[PDB]
Structure 1
Amino acid sequence: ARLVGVDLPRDKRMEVALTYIFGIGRTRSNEILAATGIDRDLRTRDLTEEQLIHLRDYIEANLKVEGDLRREVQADIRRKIEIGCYQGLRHRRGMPVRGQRTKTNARTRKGPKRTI
């Protein structure tokens, strides 16, 4: 049952099943199921087509989805790169941008150990 292109796996409940969407979390699902009237306790294999119509418009008219968040996030990190800011330079060089310690850490922004 492809909702918007994320293809929810079956045998799952709504409030978390919607969370697989890139851009919709649990707190978001609390309102996607609230403004559409769909109950929290349900199996997605029992989802009605008319109900999928009821949330095939609310999401696209009041939320924002796959693609048109990824494009925005790459767009603004690209803007920081292009403007020559401290954050942009730091993002190019791959070490932490929020002033994290770079002496015995920064492994998350860097890769595995090197051991020169």
Structure 2
Amino acid sequence: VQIQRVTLPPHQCVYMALKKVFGLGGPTSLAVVEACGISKGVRVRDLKENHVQQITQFIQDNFVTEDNLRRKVREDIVKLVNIKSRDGLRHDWGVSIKGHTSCNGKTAKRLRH
């Protein structure tokens, strides 16, 4: 079983497995399965072809997913860079946007864009 070209583990619960989709988390994954009539006791290996199709259709209509979500986030960052605001410069330089980070700013340095 794969949704949005993401393989769901067979032995895990459906609402837990859907978190692996870029753009769905705990609270939102639980909403999707219950909206389709699937409770927490249903595992991936218990699903059928019709069940997968319902989930795929519901996600596409309500949520923004892996490729479109990544593009949307990047375009937001690029706009700030072109505007040349304080935050835009920090994104371009590859450092955090907080006021005082001369002592602890390592995570923002390794997660550059």
- TM-score with structure 1 length normalisation? 0.88
Q: Give the CA deviation at 1:29.
A: 1.2
Q: Give the CA deviation at 1:11.
A: 1.2
Runs of 4+ displaced beyond 6 Å = none
Aligned alpha-carbon RMSD (Å)? 1.2
Question: Which ranges in structure 1 are unaligned for 5 or more consecutive residues?
Answer: 112-116
**Secondary structure of the equivalent of 2:66?**
coil
CA separation of 1:77 and 1:52: change in aligned 2, threshold 3 A = same
List aligned pairs for 1:74-89, cutoff 5 A: 74-89=74-89
Name the structure 2 match of 1:68: 68
- State the alpha-carbon separation in 2 of the partners of residues 6 and 54 from structure 1: 16
Question: How many residues align structurally?
Answer: 110
Q: Give the CA deviation at 1:110.
A: 2.1
Question: Which ranges in structure 2 are unaligned for 5 or more consecutive residues?
Answer: none
- State the alpha-carbon separation in 2 of the partners of residues 82 and 31 from structure 1: 38
Higher relative contact order (CA closer than 8 Å, sequence separation 6+): 2
- State the alpha-carbon separation in 2 of the partners of residues 4 and 38 from structure 1: 19
Name the structure 2 match of 1:36: 36
Tell me if the contact between 1:100 and 1:106 (Cα under 8 Å) persists in the aligned partners: no
Which structure has greater helix proportion? 2
- TM-score with structure 2 length normalisation? 0.90
- Structure 1 or 2, whichever has the larger Rg, is 1
Name the structure 2 match of 1:114: none
- State the alpha-carbon separation in 2 of the partners of residues 102 and 78 from structure 1: 23
